[PDB]
Protein backbone atom coordinates (compact mmCIF):
# COMPACT_ATOMS: atom_id res chain seq x y z
CA UNK A 1 0.00 0.00 0.00
CA UNK A 2 1.32 3.49 0.96
CA UNK A 3 5.07 4.22 1.13
CA UNK A 4 5.16 7.95 2.16
CA UNK A 5 3.97 10.04 5.13
CA UNK A 6 3.53 13.80 4.64
CA UNK A 7 1.82 16.81 6.32
CA UNK A 8 0.34 19.59 4.17
CA UNK A 9 -0.33 23.32 4.78
CA UNK A 10 -2.56 25.93 3.12
CA UNK A 11 -2.57 29.43 4.62
CA UNK A 12 -5.11 31.92 3.17
CA UNK A 13 -4.41 35.64 3.63
CA UNK A 14 -7.48 37.80 2.81
CA UNK A 15 -6.69 41.17 4.52
CA UNK A 16 -3.75 42.65 6.60
CA UNK A 17 -5.65 41.47 9.78
CA UNK A 18 -7.11 38.03 8.70
CA UNK A 19 -5.39 34.65 7.94
CA UNK A 20 -6.48 30.96 8.07
CA UNK A 21 -4.29 27.83 7.97
CA UNK A 22 -5.46 24.34 6.86
CA UNK A 23 -3.42 21.25 7.71
CA UNK A 24 -3.67 17.46 7.47
CA UNK A 25 -1.64 14.19 7.72
CA UNK A 26 -1.37 11.81 4.75
CA UNK A 27 -0.14 8.32 3.77
CA UNK A 28 0.07 9.11 0.01
CA UNK A 29 -3.61 9.62 -1.08
CA UNK A 30 -5.06 8.29 2.25
CA UNK A 31 -5.69 10.87 5.03
CA UNK A 32 -4.85 9.59 8.52
CA UNK A 33 -4.70 12.96 10.33
CA UNK A 34 -6.65 16.17 10.31
CA UNK A 35 -6.20 19.44 12.15
CA UNK A 36 -8.79 21.38 14.10
CA UNK A 37 -7.65 25.03 13.81
CA UNK A 38 -10.12 26.24 16.52
CA UNK A 39 -8.49 24.21 19.36
CA UNK A 40 -5.13 23.43 17.70
CA UNK A 41 -5.52 19.66 18.12
CA UNK A 42 -4.96 16.84 15.64
CA UNK A 43 -7.78 14.51 14.53
CA UNK A 44 -6.82 10.83 14.40
CA UNK A 45 -8.94 9.50 11.49
CA UNK A 46 -7.93 5.83 12.12
CA UNK A 47 -7.28 3.90 15.44
CA UNK A 48 -3.64 3.24 14.30
CA UNK A 49 -2.96 6.95 13.27
CA UNK A 50 -0.62 7.51 16.25
CA UNK A 51 1.54 4.61 14.92
CA UNK A 52 3.70 3.07 17.65
CA UNK A 53 4.29 6.52 19.31
CA UNK A 54 3.14 6.93 22.94
CA UNK A 55 0.67 9.68 23.95
CA UNK A 56 3.77 11.54 25.28
CA UNK A 57 5.40 11.91 21.79
CA UNK A 58 2.03 12.44 19.99
CA UNK A 59 1.21 15.42 22.32
CA UNK A 60 4.74 16.94 21.76
CA UNK A 61 4.24 16.76 18.01
CA UNK A 62 0.77 18.36 18.29
CA UNK A 63 2.38 21.28 20.30
CA UNK A 64 5.01 21.99 17.56
CA UNK A 65 2.23 22.37 14.89
CA UNK A 66 0.04 24.31 17.39
CA UNK A 67 2.97 26.79 17.91
CA UNK A 68 3.95 26.70 14.19
CA UNK A 69 0.39 27.43 12.86
CA UNK A 70 -0.33 30.21 15.51
CA UNK A 71 3.07 31.82 14.84
CA UNK A 72 3.18 31.33 11.00
CA UNK A 73 0.51 33.97 10.14
CA UNK A 74 1.92 36.85 12.31
CA UNK A 75 5.50 36.32 10.89
CA UNK A 76 4.44 36.48 7.20
CA UNK A 77 1.78 39.25 7.81
CA UNK A 78 4.49 41.52 9.37
CA UNK A 79 6.98 40.61 6.61
CA UNK A 80 4.27 41.09 3.88
CA UNK A 81 5.33 44.76 3.54
CA UNK A 82 9.04 43.70 3.51
CA UNK A 83 8.57 41.21 0.60
CA UNK A 84 6.19 43.70 -1.25
CA UNK A 85 3.23 41.22 -1.10
CA UNK A 86 -0.39 42.32 -1.69
CA UNK A 87 -3.52 40.76 -0.16
CA UNK A 88 -4.98 38.29 -1.07
CA UNK A 89 -2.18 35.67 -1.34
CA UNK A 90 -1.94 31.92 -0.51
CA UNK A 91 0.95 29.94 1.04
CA UNK A 92 1.18 26.13 0.52
CA UNK A 93 3.51 23.58 2.07
CA UNK A 94 4.31 19.84 2.11
CA UNK A 95 6.87 17.98 4.26
CA UNK A 96 7.63 14.51 5.52
CA UNK A 97 9.55 11.39 4.60
CA UNK A 98 9.16 8.73 1.86
CA UNK A 99 10.53 5.19 1.48
CA UNK A 100 12.68 5.03 -1.67
CA UNK A 101 15.27 3.08 -3.68
CA UNK A 102 15.92 3.59 2.54
CA UNK A 103 13.93 6.69 3.68
CA UNK A 104 14.28 10.16 2.03
CA UNK A 105 12.89 13.28 3.83
CA UNK A 106 11.44 16.30 1.90
CA UNK A 107 9.96 19.84 2.35
CA UNK A 108 8.38 22.16 -0.32
CA UNK A 109 6.88 25.67 -0.29
CA UNK A 110 4.59 27.60 -2.71
CA UNK A 111 3.18 31.14 -3.15
CA UNK A 112 0.27 31.85 -5.55
CA UNK A 113 0.33 28.20 -6.74
CA UNK A 114 3.92 28.58 -8.03
CA UNK A 115 6.96 26.84 -6.45
CA UNK A 116 8.87 28.80 -3.75
CA UNK A 117 11.40 26.53 -2.01
CA UNK A 118 12.74 22.96 -1.55
CA UNK A 119 15.13 21.24 0.92
CA UNK A 120 18.28 19.35 -0.19
CA UNK A 121 20.89 18.34 2.48
CA UNK A 122 19.01 20.38 5.22
CA UNK A 123 19.33 23.73 3.26
CA UNK A 124 16.92 26.42 1.94
CA UNK A 125 17.04 25.86 -1.83
CA UNK A 126 14.93 28.61 -3.50
CA UNK A 127 12.73 27.86 -6.53
CA UNK A 128 13.42 29.68 -9.86
CA UNK A 129 9.65 30.45 -10.18
CA UNK A 130 9.59 32.15 -6.73
CA UNK A 131 12.10 34.75 -7.96
CA UNK A 132 13.84 37.36 -5.76
CA UNK A 133 11.34 36.69 -2.88
CA UNK A 134 12.58 33.06 -2.71
CA UNK A 135 16.19 34.41 -2.75
CA UNK A 136 15.43 37.01 0.02
CA UNK A 137 13.38 34.51 2.14
CA UNK A 138 16.01 31.71 2.09
CA UNK A 139 18.62 34.39 3.03
CA UNK A 140 16.24 35.47 5.90
CA UNK A 141 15.08 32.06 7.29
CA UNK A 142 18.76 30.89 7.70
CA UNK A 143 19.04 33.34 10.71
CA UNK A 144 16.03 31.63 12.47
CA UNK A 145 18.20 28.88 14.02
CA UNK A 146 15.28 27.70 16.18
CA UNK A 147 13.02 26.95 13.18
CA UNK A 148 15.95 25.49 11.13
CA UNK A 149 17.01 23.14 13.95
CA UNK A 150 13.42 21.93 14.70
CA UNK A 151 12.65 21.10 11.01
CA UNK A 152 15.94 19.03 10.96
CA UNK A 153 14.92 16.72 13.87
CA UNK A 154 11.36 16.55 12.46
CA UNK A 155 12.53 15.66 8.93
CA UNK A 156 15.55 13.35 9.56
CA UNK A 157 14.86 11.82 13.05
CA UNK A 158 11.19 11.68 14.19
CA UNK A 159 9.53 11.23 10.73
CA UNK A 160 11.44 8.04 9.54
CA UNK A 161 10.76 6.38 12.95
CA UNK A 162 7.08 7.39 12.59
CA UNK A 163 6.64 6.22 8.92
CA UNK A 164 7.78 2.61 9.80
CA UNK A 165 5.55 2.42 12.90
CA UNK A 166 2.37 3.76 11.26
CA UNK A 167 2.71 1.40 8.21
CA UNK A 168 2.90 -1.61 10.62
CA UNK A 169 0.25 -0.35 13.17
CA UNK A 170 -2.35 -0.31 10.38
CA UNK A 171 -1.36 -2.96 7.80
CA UNK A 172 -4.89 -4.51 8.11
CA UNK A 173 -6.24 -1.28 6.49
CA UNK A 174 -3.29 -0.54 4.12
CA UNK A 175 -2.57 -4.02 2.70
CA UNK A 176 -6.28 -5.12 2.48
CA UNK A 177 -7.75 -6.11 -0.92
CA UNK A 178 -11.18 -4.61 -1.78
CA UNK A 179 -12.97 -6.21 -4.78
CA UNK A 180 -14.41 -3.65 -7.28
CA UNK A 181 -17.93 -3.49 -8.68
CA UNK A 182 -18.47 -3.18 -12.40
CA UNK A 183 -21.53 -2.28 -14.53
CA UNK A 184 -22.14 -1.03 -18.10
CA UNK A 185 -24.07 2.00 -19.50
CA UNK A 186 -24.66 3.88 -22.80
CA UNK A 187 -23.22 7.37 -23.49
CA UNK A 188 -24.96 10.22 -25.42
CA UNK A 189 -22.94 10.05 -28.71
CA UNK A 190 -26.25 5.79 -35.18
CA UNK A 191 -23.18 6.33 -32.94
CA UNK A 192 -22.69 5.12 -29.36
CA UNK A 193 -20.38 5.68 -26.40
CA UNK A 194 -19.87 2.43 -24.46
CA UNK A 195 -19.21 3.31 -20.81
CA UNK A 196 -17.69 0.88 -18.29
CA UNK A 197 -17.70 1.64 -14.53
CA UNK A 198 -15.37 0.11 -11.96
CA UNK A 199 -16.20 1.31 -8.44
CA UNK A 200 -14.89 0.36 -5.02
CA UNK A 201 -11.44 -1.08 -5.72
CA UNK A 202 -8.42 -0.89 -3.39
CA UNK A 203 -5.43 -0.52 -3.89
CA UNK A 204 -5.32 2.11 -6.75
CA UNK A 205 -3.55 -0.03 -9.55
CA UNK A 206 -6.26 -1.43 -11.90
CA UNK A 207 -6.53 -2.86 -15.45
CA UNK A 208 -9.70 -1.84 -17.34
CA UNK A 209 -10.19 -2.25 -21.13
CA UNK A 210 -12.92 -2.94 -23.79
CA UNK A 211 -12.54 -6.26 -25.69
CA UNK A 212 -13.58 -8.21 -28.81
CA UNK A 213 -13.44 -11.78 -27.45
CA UNK A 214 -9.73 -12.22 -26.63
CA UNK A 215 -8.58 -9.16 -28.72
CA UNK A 216 -7.86 -5.75 -27.05
CA UNK A 217 -9.45 -2.54 -28.42
CA UNK A 218 -6.92 0.35 -28.86
CA UNK A 219 -9.69 3.01 -28.97
CA UNK A 220 -10.59 2.75 -25.23
CA UNK A 221 -10.63 6.11 -23.41
CA UNK A 222 -9.64 5.53 -19.71
CA UNK A 223 -10.84 8.39 -17.48
CA UNK A 224 -9.41 9.79 -14.24
CA UNK A 225 -9.05 7.51 -11.17
CA UNK A 226 -11.55 9.44 -9.03
CA UNK A 227 -11.67 9.14 -5.20
CA UNK A 228 -14.55 7.12 -3.81
CA UNK A 229 -15.56 7.38 -0.14
CA UNK A 230 -14.14 5.65 1.93
CA UNK A 231 -10.58 4.61 0.84
CA UNK A 232 -11.87 3.02 -2.43
CA UNK A 233 -11.49 4.23 -6.03
CA UNK A 234 -13.72 4.95 -9.06
CA UNK A 235 -12.95 4.60 -12.80
CA UNK A 236 -14.79 4.73 -16.19
CA UNK A 237 -13.45 3.42 -19.56
CA UNK A 238 -15.43 4.68 -22.59
CA UNK A 239 -15.59 3.44 -26.24
CA UNK A 240 -16.97 5.34 -29.27
CA UNK A 241 -18.23 2.89 -32.00
CA UNK A 242 -20.90 2.18 -34.73
CA UNK A 243 -24.50 1.04 -33.85
CA UNK A 244 -23.80 -2.44 -35.28
CA UNK A 245 -20.20 -2.56 -33.90
CA UNK A 246 -21.52 -2.97 -30.26
CA UNK A 247 -22.26 -6.74 -30.81
CA UNK A 248 -19.57 -9.06 -29.42
CA UNK A 249 -17.98 -6.41 -27.13
CA UNK A 250 -17.11 -6.73 -23.42
CA UNK A 251 -15.48 -4.74 -20.61
CA UNK A 252 -12.66 -6.69 -18.88
CA UNK A 253 -11.48 -5.67 -15.36
CA UNK A 254 -8.23 -7.00 -13.77
CA UNK A 255 -7.32 -6.18 -10.14
CA UNK A 256 -5.18 -7.68 -7.31
CA UNK A 257 -8.35 -8.48 -5.22
CA UNK A 258 -9.92 -10.50 -8.11
CA UNK A 259 -7.31 -13.38 -7.72
CA UNK A 260 -7.28 -14.67 -11.32
CA UNK A 261 -11.10 -14.45 -11.87
CA UNK A 262 -11.36 -11.17 -13.83
CA UNK A 263 -14.64 -9.22 -14.17
CA UNK A 264 -15.87 -9.82 -17.73
CA UNK A 265 -19.08 -7.89 -18.64
CA UNK A 266 -20.62 -8.38 -22.10
CA UNK A 267 -22.54 -5.64 -24.12
Amino acid at each position, epitope marked *: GPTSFHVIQTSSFTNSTWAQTQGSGWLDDLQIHGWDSDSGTAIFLKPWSKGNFSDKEVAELE*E*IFR*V*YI*F*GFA*R*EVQDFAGDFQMKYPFEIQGIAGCELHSAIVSFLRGALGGLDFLSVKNASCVPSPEGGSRAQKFCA*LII*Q*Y*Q*G*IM*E*TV*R*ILLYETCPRYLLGVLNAGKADLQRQVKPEAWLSSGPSGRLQLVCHVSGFYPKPVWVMWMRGEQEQQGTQLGDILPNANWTWYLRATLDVADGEAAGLSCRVKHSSLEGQDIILYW
Partner: T-cell receptor, first 108, second 119 residues
Framework: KTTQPPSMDCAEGRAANLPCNHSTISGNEYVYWYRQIHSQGPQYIIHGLKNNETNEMASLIITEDRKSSTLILPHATLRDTAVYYCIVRVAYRQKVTFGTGTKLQVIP | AGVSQSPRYKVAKRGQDVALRCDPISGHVSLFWYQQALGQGPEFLTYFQNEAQLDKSGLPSDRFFAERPEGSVSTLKIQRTQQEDSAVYLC?????????????????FGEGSRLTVLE
Protein backbone atom coordinates in the same frame (compact mmCIF):
# COMPACT_ATOMS: atom_id res chain seq x y z
CA LYS B 1 16.74 19.63 34.56
CA THR B 2 19.80 21.85 34.99
CA THR B 3 22.30 21.43 37.81
CA GLN B 4 24.63 24.24 38.99
CA PRO B 5 26.83 24.70 42.13
CA PRO B 6 24.77 26.55 44.85
CA SER B 7 27.63 29.04 45.61
CA MET B 8 30.76 30.45 43.90
CA ASP B 9 33.47 32.90 45.03
CA CYS B 10 35.29 34.90 42.39
CA ALA B 11 38.05 37.49 42.73
CA GLU B 12 37.24 41.01 41.47
CA GLY B 13 38.81 41.71 38.05
CA ARG B 14 39.19 37.97 37.22
CA ALA B 15 37.08 35.78 34.89
CA ALA B 16 34.03 34.06 36.36
CA ASN B 17 33.31 30.63 34.80
CA LEU B 18 29.79 29.65 35.79
CA PRO B 19 29.09 25.93 35.07
CA CYS B 20 25.70 24.39 34.22
CA ASN B 21 24.89 20.70 33.57
CA HIS B 22 22.02 19.38 31.41
CA SER B 23 21.83 15.71 30.17
CA THR B 24 20.47 16.45 26.67
CA ILE B 25 20.62 20.10 25.33
CA SER B 26 19.02 18.94 22.00
CA GLY B 27 19.77 20.68 18.68
CA ASN B 28 16.72 22.88 19.40
CA GLU B 29 16.97 23.01 23.34
CA TYR B 30 18.37 26.59 24.11
CA VAL B 31 20.60 27.76 26.94
CA TYR B 32 19.51 31.01 28.60
CA TRP B 33 21.34 32.69 31.45
CA TYR B 34 19.57 35.13 33.81
CA ARG B 35 20.99 37.32 36.63
CA GLN B 36 19.07 38.24 39.82
CA ILE B 37 20.11 41.04 42.30
CA HIS B 38 18.55 41.39 45.85
CA SER B 39 14.85 42.67 45.88
CA GLN B 40 14.73 42.46 42.01
CA GLY B 41 13.44 40.22 39.21
CA PRO B 42 15.68 38.16 36.88
CA GLN B 43 17.38 39.88 33.88
CA TYR B 44 18.51 38.26 30.63
CA ILE B 45 22.34 38.00 30.10
CA ILE B 46 22.92 35.77 27.02
CA HIS B 47 21.43 32.75 25.12
CA GLY B 48 22.49 30.22 22.47
CA LEU B 49 21.22 26.95 21.03
CA LYS B 50 24.40 25.93 19.13
CA ASN B 51 26.92 28.67 18.24
CA ASN B 52 28.90 29.99 21.21
CA GLU B 53 27.84 33.63 21.66
CA THR B 54 30.00 36.66 22.66
CA ASN B 55 27.82 39.72 23.57
CA GLU B 56 28.86 43.06 25.27
CA MET B 57 28.30 41.71 28.88
CA ALA B 58 29.27 37.98 28.83
CA SER B 59 30.22 34.94 26.68
CA LEU B 60 28.41 31.58 26.40
CA ILE B 61 30.25 28.32 25.58
CA ILE B 62 28.22 25.14 24.87
CA THR B 63 30.31 21.96 24.84
CA GLU B 64 30.35 20.20 21.41
CA ASP B 65 29.33 17.21 23.62
CA ARG B 66 26.25 19.38 24.59
CA LYS B 67 25.85 18.00 28.14
CA SER B 68 27.15 21.14 29.91
CA SER B 69 27.41 24.91 29.39
CA THR B 70 29.56 27.66 30.94
CA LEU B 71 28.84 31.42 31.33
CA ILE B 72 31.99 33.57 31.09
CA LEU B 73 32.21 36.96 32.82
CA PRO B 74 35.57 38.25 31.43
CA HIS B 75 36.31 40.72 34.26
CA ALA B 76 34.09 40.36 37.30
CA THR B 77 32.91 43.67 38.83
CA LEU B 78 31.17 44.20 42.24
CA ARG B 79 27.93 44.84 40.28
CA ASP B 80 28.23 41.13 39.13
CA THR B 81 27.36 39.74 42.62
CA ALA B 82 24.05 38.01 41.89
CA VAL B 83 22.31 34.65 41.61
CA TYR B 84 22.99 33.24 38.12
CA TYR B 85 20.36 30.98 36.64
CA CYS B 86 20.93 28.50 33.82
CA ILE B 87 17.74 27.56 31.98
CA VAL B 88 17.14 25.19 29.03
CA ARG B 89 14.25 25.89 26.65
CA VAL B 90 13.09 23.70 23.75
CA ALA B 91 12.67 26.16 20.80
CA TYR B 92 8.79 25.79 20.51
CA ARG B 93 8.19 25.76 24.35
CA GLN B 94 7.37 29.07 26.08
CA LYS B 95 7.45 27.93 29.75
CA VAL B 96 10.82 28.73 31.43
CA THR B 97 11.75 26.73 34.58
CA PHE B 98 14.28 28.15 37.06
CA GLY B 99 16.39 26.02 39.41
CA THR B 100 18.15 27.17 42.61
CA GLY B 101 21.04 28.72 40.59
CA THR B 102 24.58 29.83 41.55
CA LYS B 103 25.24 32.51 44.18
CA LEU B 104 28.23 34.41 42.71
CA GLN B 105 30.19 36.34 45.34
CA VAL B 106 32.60 38.85 43.73
CA ILE B 107 35.26 39.27 46.46
CA PRO B 108 36.48 42.97 46.39
CA ALA C 1 9.52 49.77 28.37
CA GLY C 2 9.02 47.50 31.42
CA VAL C 3 6.59 45.20 33.23
CA SER C 4 4.73 47.00 36.09
CA GLN C 5 3.76 45.01 39.19
CA SER C 6 1.48 46.54 41.86
CA PRO C 7 1.39 46.66 44.87
CA ARG C 8 5.18 46.29 45.15
CA TYR C 9 4.68 45.45 48.88
CA LYS C 10 1.61 44.01 50.62
CA VAL C 11 0.85 43.32 54.30
CA ALA C 12 -2.23 41.16 54.71
CA LYS C 13 -4.28 39.69 57.55
CA ARG C 14 -4.53 35.87 57.57
CA GLY C 15 -7.89 34.83 56.05
CA GLN C 16 -8.16 37.91 53.81
CA ASP C 17 -8.16 38.12 50.01
CA VAL C 18 -5.31 39.85 48.10
CA ALA C 19 -5.16 40.94 44.41
CA LEU C 20 -1.84 41.34 42.56
CA ARG C 21 -1.67 43.19 39.23
CA CYS C 22 0.78 42.86 36.32
CA ASP C 23 0.86 45.38 33.41
CA PRO C 24 3.14 43.75 30.77
CA ILE C 25 4.92 45.37 27.80
CA SER C 26 2.45 46.15 24.98
CA GLY C 27 2.41 43.45 22.26
CA HIS C 28 4.01 40.71 24.41
CA VAL C 29 1.85 37.59 23.79
CA SER C 30 3.39 35.56 26.66
CA LEU C 31 2.74 36.40 30.33
CA PHE C 32 4.11 34.22 33.11
CA TRP C 33 3.47 34.24 36.84
CA TYR C 34 6.08 33.01 39.31
CA GLN C 35 6.31 32.69 43.12
CA GLN C 36 9.66 33.16 44.87
CA ALA C 37 10.46 32.14 48.47
CA LEU C 38 13.64 33.22 50.40
CA GLY C 39 16.86 31.56 49.13
CA GLN C 40 15.01 29.75 46.31
CA GLY C 41 14.63 30.34 42.55
CA PRO C 42 11.39 31.54 40.86
CA GLU C 43 8.66 28.87 40.71
CA PHE C 44 6.21 28.65 37.86
CA LEU C 45 2.56 29.28 38.74
CA THR C 46 0.67 29.94 35.46
CA TYR C 47 1.34 30.94 31.80
CA PHE C 48 -0.81 32.91 29.33
CA GLN C 49 -0.77 33.13 25.52
CA ASN C 50 -2.81 36.33 25.13
CA GLU C 51 -6.11 35.82 27.08
CA ALA C 52 -5.78 31.95 27.16
CA GLN C 53 -4.38 30.27 30.34
CA LEU C 54 -2.54 27.36 28.59
CA ASP C 55 -0.66 26.00 31.66
CA LYS C 56 -1.56 26.62 35.28
CA SER C 57 0.06 23.44 36.76
CA GLY C 58 2.23 25.46 39.20
CA LEU C 59 -0.70 27.02 41.18
CA PRO C 60 -0.30 26.05 44.90
CA SER C 61 -4.02 25.61 45.79
CA ASP C 62 -7.79 25.93 45.01
CA ARG C 63 -7.41 29.59 46.43
CA PHE C 64 -4.98 30.92 43.71
CA PHE C 65 -6.72 32.21 40.55
CA ALA C 66 -5.31 34.15 37.59
CA GLU C 67 -6.94 36.02 34.67
CA ARG C 68 -5.94 38.12 31.61
CA PRO C 69 -9.39 39.05 30.12
CA GLU C 70 -8.16 41.36 27.29
CA GLY C 71 -4.82 39.56 26.83
CA SER C 72 -2.67 42.36 28.35
CA VAL C 73 -3.03 43.12 32.11
CA SER C 74 -3.06 40.06 34.41
CA THR C 75 -4.35 39.75 37.99
CA LEU C 76 -3.22 36.98 40.39
CA LYS C 77 -5.86 36.68 43.12
CA ILE C 78 -5.06 34.93 46.41
CA GLN C 79 -8.18 34.10 48.54
CA ARG C 80 -8.11 33.28 52.31
CA THR C 81 -4.38 34.16 52.49
CA GLN C 82 -2.30 31.95 54.80
CA GLN C 83 1.20 32.62 56.27
CA GLU C 84 2.68 30.04 53.81
CA ASP C 85 1.66 32.38 50.89
CA SER C 86 4.28 34.98 52.05
CA ALA C 87 6.65 35.29 49.02
CA VAL C 88 7.70 37.53 46.10
CA TYR C 89 5.31 37.13 43.21
CA LEU C 90 7.17 37.70 39.96
CA CYS C 91 5.58 38.49 36.62
CA UNK C 92 7.26 38.24 33.23
CA UNK C 93 6.29 38.89 29.62
CA UNK C 94 7.86 37.71 26.35
CA UNK C 95 7.21 38.78 22.73
CA UNK C 96 6.55 35.08 21.68
CA UNK C 97 7.87 35.88 18.13
CA UNK C 98 10.19 33.62 16.08
CA UNK C 99 13.84 34.17 17.18
CA UNK C 100 16.12 35.13 14.27
CA UNK C 101 18.98 37.62 14.51
CA UNK C 102 18.80 40.27 17.31
CA UNK C 103 15.58 38.58 18.72
CA UNK C 104 16.65 37.46 22.21
CA UNK C 105 13.23 35.88 22.96
CA UNK C 106 13.98 36.78 26.60
CA UNK C 107 11.68 37.13 29.61
CA UNK C 108 11.17 40.68 30.81
CA PHE C 109 10.47 40.60 34.53
CA GLY C 110 8.67 43.14 36.69
CA GLU C 111 10.04 44.44 39.99
CA GLY C 112 7.96 41.87 41.92
CA SER C 113 5.19 42.03 44.55
CA ARG C 114 6.43 41.17 48.07
CA LEU C 115 3.48 39.63 49.98
CA THR C 116 3.72 39.22 53.81
CA VAL C 117 0.83 37.42 55.59
CA LEU C 118 0.43 37.98 59.35
CA GLU C 119 -2.10 36.63 61.91
Amino acid sequence: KTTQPPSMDCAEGRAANLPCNHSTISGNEYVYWYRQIHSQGPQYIIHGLKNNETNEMASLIITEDRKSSTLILPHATLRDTAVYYCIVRVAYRQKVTFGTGTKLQVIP
Amino acid sequence: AGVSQSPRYKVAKRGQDVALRCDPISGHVSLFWYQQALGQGPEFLTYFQNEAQLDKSGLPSDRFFAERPEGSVSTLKIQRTQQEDSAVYLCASSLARAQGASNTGELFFGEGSRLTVLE
